[PDB]
Amino acid sequence: TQMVLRAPKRTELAKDGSYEKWMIEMEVGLRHRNPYASGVLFTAAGK
Amino acid sequence: TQMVLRAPKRTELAKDGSYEKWMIEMEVGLRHRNPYASGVLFTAAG
C-alpha cells in the first residue's frame, strides 16, 4: 500500500516580486503486510 | 505607436512582518514606422 500523509496540493507562495514561485509538495510511505509475503531475486554473474 | 505588453497592475507582494509592501509594474515600448517619417532638430547656439 501507499501510505500518504500530505497528498499533493497547490501552493500559494509569497510571490513578492516580478517573479512567480510555485511548489508541489508531497509525503508518501510504503507498507508491506508481511516481509515473506513477497520475494526479491538479485542477479549475479553466470558460470 | 505605443507598444503595450503588460498593462499597469497593482500587485500586493509578500509581507514577512509589518512591511505591507505593494508594487506597480508596467511593460511598454515605442515603435516608429520609418526613421525619416519624423524629424528632430537640436538647439545648440555654441
CA distance B18 to B37: 53
Q: Is A37 helix (H, G, I), strand (E, B) or coil?
A: helix
CA distance B11 to B21: 9
CB contact, 8 Å: B5 with chain A?
no
Tell me the residue type at A34.
Answer: N
CA distance B39 to A6: 65
- Which cell numbers hold the place of B18? 509589518
- Which cell numbers hold the place of B44? 545648440
Which residues from A are below 8 Å from B21, CB to CB?
Answer: 16
- CA-angle at B33, arms to B2 and B27, nearest 5°: 25
Instruction: Please tell me what resolution, in angstroms, this structure has.
Output: 3.5
CA distance B44 to B32: 25
The closest CB to that of A18, out of B14, B21, B25, belongs to B25
Which residues from B are below 8 Å from A12, CB to CB?
Answer: none
CA distance B30 to B3: 6
Technique of determination: cryo-EM
Which residues from A are below 8 Å from B15, CB to CB?
Answer: 14, 16
